[PDB]
Amino acid sequence: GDLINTVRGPIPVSEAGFTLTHEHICGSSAGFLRAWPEFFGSRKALAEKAVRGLRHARAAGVQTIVDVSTFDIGRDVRLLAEVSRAADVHIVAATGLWFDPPLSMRMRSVEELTQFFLREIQHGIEDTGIRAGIIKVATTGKATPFQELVLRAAARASLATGVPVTTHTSASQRDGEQQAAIFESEGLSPSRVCIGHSDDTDDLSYLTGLAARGYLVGLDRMPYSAIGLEGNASALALFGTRSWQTRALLIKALIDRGYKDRILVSHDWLFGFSSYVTNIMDVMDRINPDGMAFVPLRVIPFLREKGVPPETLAGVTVANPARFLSPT
Ligand SMILES: CCOP(O)(=S)OCC
Ligand SMILES: [Co+2]
Ligand SMILES: [Fe+2]
User: Fold this and answer.
1) Is residue 68 a contact partner of residue 95, using CB atoms and an 8 Å limit?
2) Which of the residues bear the PTM N6-carboxylysine (predicted)?
């Protein structure tokens, strides 16, 4: 009965299946893929790489990913549609703004930002008619004044449409608490909200505090680790020094504390990556050759071997996303 918008059109919520809720086809910038496709080798190479990756994830049991690339992550919805078709993996596109908005966005009011997010949800992205099924926002510490607007506009667009809101945080600085306060001041239900990059900290007081309030807790950087790369400053800074097993243990920690229905798991992976150092993609592909299959291939069995019941693992990877993505 319930429907979610994908880049290939509407699908029944029940067909979303095993869903990775924070992923990217390509992490880039507005206009960039159009202006400088050679940065990625070519558009064709980038698409082929993405299709091979999503097919690998599909073979591992992934049926849907949520591509949380916003306008300013250089989201290219035609690219998403082409790769979703070729790999036969659903992709839900995002609206919202991440932490690289250009001046034409930064100068906008909360009202004007709301109109923009609503356009992408209700009318379509660009001239494509492809509708966004989630709203992505971001802080990196205390919200800037503009980021406050963005979080408010995201709350208002969500209330209007029922589409959920997902966040980038600096987890170590406990951004979720301020994001939560702002969302609740707009009257948004915490069940419509996922506080992302929450596996970047082992602070369970912070994480259980959010979960107790009804937030979804996004443990979405599973394969990120610079262990063994500590001499590569840019890898260290982005990936951290905690192992994937350390990250995965948080899933179990939250389940053991009664919060199984409040967890979303993902990789934050990508197949192209121009908003960071050059050749960062090669470093990542060495760290995690399995790409977006890493969760089903490594994380889920690790949890199973620690005694997490299959029904609980299914609730986390299928029922939680379905509940989150269903417009409510
Ligand atoms: C390493 C990827 O980090 P993000 O979720 S902030 O996306 C970057 C495009
Ligand atoms: Co992020
Ligand atoms: Fe991301």
Assistant:
1) no
2) 136
Partners of residue 219 on adjacent β-strands: 265
Token pair for 307: 């005694």
Longest Cα pair distance anywhere in the chain, in angstroms?
Answer: 52
Q: What is the 3-state secondary structure (H, E, C) of 46-59?
A: HHHHHHHHHHHHHH
Question: How close is the Cα of 53 to the center of ligand 2, in Å?
Answer: 20
Domains of the chain: 1-328 (3.20.20.140)
Inter-helix orientation angle 145-161/175-185, to 10°: 50
Q: State how far the Cα of 24 lies from the Cα of 34, in Å rounded to an integer.
A: 17
Minimum CA distance residue for ligand 1 atom 7 = 27
The technique by which this structure was obtained is X-ray
- Rounded CA gap, 269 and 284, in Å? 9
CA angle, 144 then 148 then 151, to 5°: 130
| Least distant ligand from the CA of 75 | 1
